[PDB]
Ligand binder design. Structure first.
Ligand code: CA
Length: 227
C-alpha cells in the first residue's frame, strides 16, 4: 500500500488536487493534462507530490530513498519530469526525465518517434549539470525507479542502471515526484508558453499534439532521515 507519508500528507503536500492521484490504497495516477497545475516560474503542467516546506533542510543534511514501480503513458514528442530535487531558490539539483526529443547524448535522441529516453540531470558541486541516459521505453511500458539522496550524494537507478554524483548543496532542499509535463518543443527544445499563465500551456500542449500523459506509480516507498 501507498505509505502514510503520502496518503495523509505527513511528508508530502499534494500538488494538483483535482483529481487526487490516490485512486486506491495501492496506486497513484498522475494526470497533469487534467490537474493543469503550475509553478509560479515553470513551463508546463504538473501532478505531483512535494516535501512540505516545514520539513526541509540542506541536501547534505538529508538521507532519503524514494522507490516506485512506474508506468508511463505519453504522447509522442512528450517530455516529463517524474522526480526531482530543488533548492530553496527554486534551482534544479536533480531531475529524472522521460522524453521523446532530439536532445543529443541519449540512447535514442530521436524527436517524436515514440521511443522515450529516460535520463537524469544532476547538478555537480561546481554548479554544472551532468546528464546520463538510464534507458529507453515506449508508452505503456513500466520500469522500477530508485532515487537516493545520501546526504548530498545523489544516485538514480532505472532499468537496473545507476548513475550518481555528489551535488551542489543548498539550505532548504526538497524532493518531488509524479508527472511534471514540460511545455517544450521536442525538436528545437525551446520552452513554450509563459510562466505563471496556465492557459498558455493549454495551447502549447494542444499544438504539440500532447493530449496523453499518465504516470502510474505502485509499490511506492519513501525513507527519510535528517542529521
Ligand atoms: Ca525518441
Amino acid at each position: 500500500t501507498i505509505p502514510s507519508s503520502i496518503t495523509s500528507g505527513s511528508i508530502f503536500d499534494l500538488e494538483g488536487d483535482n483529481p487526487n492521484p490516490l485512486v486506491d490504497d495501492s496506486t497513484l495516477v498522475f494526470v497533469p493534462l487534467e490537474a493543469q497545475h503550475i509553478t509560479p516560474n515553470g513551463n508546463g503542467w504538473r501532478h505531483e507530490y512535494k516535501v512540505k516546506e516545514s520539513l526541509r533542510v540542506a541536501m547534505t543534511q538529508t538521507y532519503e530513498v524514494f522507490e516506485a514501480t512506474v508506468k508511463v503513458e505519453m504522447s509522442d514528442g512528450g517530455k516529463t519530469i517524474i522526480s526531482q530535487h530543488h533548492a530553496s531558490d527554486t534551482g534544479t539539483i536533480s531531475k529524472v526525465y522521460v522524453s521523446d526529443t532530439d536532445e543529443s547524448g541519449f540512447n535514442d535522441s530521436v524527436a517524436n518517434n515514440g521511443i522515450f529516453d529516460v535520463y537524469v540531470r544532476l547538478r555537480n558541486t561546481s554548479g554544472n549539470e551532468e546528464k546520463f541516459a538510464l534507458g529507453t521505453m515506449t508508452s505503456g511500458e513500466t520500469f522500477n525507479l530508485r532515487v537516493v539522496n545520501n546526504y548530498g550524494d545523489v544516485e538514480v537507478t532505472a532499468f537496473g542502471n545507476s548513475f550518481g554524483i555528489p551535488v551542489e548543496d543548498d539550505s532548504q532542499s526538497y524532493f518531488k515526484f509524479g508527472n511534471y509535463l514540460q511545455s517544450q518543443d521536442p525538436y528545437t527544445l525551446d520552452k513554450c508558453g509563459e510562466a505563471g499563465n496556465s492557459n498558455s500551456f493549454k495551447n502549447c500542449f494542444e499544438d504539440l499534439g500532447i493530449t496523453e500523459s499518465k504516470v502510474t506509480m505502485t509499490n511506492v516507498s519513501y525513507t527519510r532521515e535528517t542529521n
